[PDB]
């Protein structure tokens, strides 16, 4: 009851932190593909 | 009553995927960004 209620926030948190830990990945490989584009100046 | 056990199965699986995301963050955000800017 009470302890199950504590579970809900953690699930509501874990799904929440995944949302804004994948949100960094979209900005992450955006710069990795911008950096690998610099390899055109070498190849 | 019984539904409690599934919440940990939601905690366990959803917390193990955050491990994989963090590991893939080690390669992308820190490693290959910094390493391949140098080359």
């Amino acid at each position, epitope marked *: 009851r009470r302890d199950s209620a504590t579970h809900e926030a953690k699930i509501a948190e874990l*799904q929440a932190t*995944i949302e804004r830990l994948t949100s960094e990945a*979209a900005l992450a490989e955006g710069a990795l*593909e911008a950096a690998r584009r610099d390899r055109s100046r070498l190849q | 009553r019984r539904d409690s056990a599934t919440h940990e199965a939601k905690i366990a*699986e959803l917390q*193990a*995927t955050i491990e994989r995301l963090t590991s893939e963050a080690a390669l992308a955000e820190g490693a290959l960004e910094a390493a391949r800017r140098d080359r």
Partner: nanobody
Framework: DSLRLSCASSRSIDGINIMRWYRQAPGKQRGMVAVVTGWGSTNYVDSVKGRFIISRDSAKDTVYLQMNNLKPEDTAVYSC?????????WGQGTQVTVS
């Protein structure tokens, strides 16, 4: 034009955690396209943002990668990726030629 992509899944009805789509630029490294989650938070990489849409099909057990407002730079070998129980499950990969 505007093509559609699907990623057939062997299991996980409704327990569909991160299903993200990767394209391999020919002669180059693999890439990021988008992600999807069980709850539905889908984000996209900056180079495709506002064009692609990635939506689950929980009943049919398949994650769609819609291609819209395409450019000829998207010719790549396309490969869907999974994370269930923390392990990664790729696929045979397909190709979309835009030229």
């Amino acid at each position: 034009d505007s093509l559609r992509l699907s990623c057939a899944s062997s299991r996980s009805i409704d327990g569909i955690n991160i299903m993200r789509w990767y394209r391999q630029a020919p002669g180059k490294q693999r890439g990021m396209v988008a992600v999807v989650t069980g709850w539905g938070s889908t984000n996209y990489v900056d180079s495709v943002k506002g064009r692609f849409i990635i939506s689950r099909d929980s009943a049919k057990d398949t994650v769609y990668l819609q291609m819209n407002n395409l450019k000829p730079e998207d010719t790549a070998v396309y490969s869907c990726n999974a994370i269930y129980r923390g392990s990664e499950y790729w696929g045979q990969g397909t190709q979309v030629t835009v030229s």
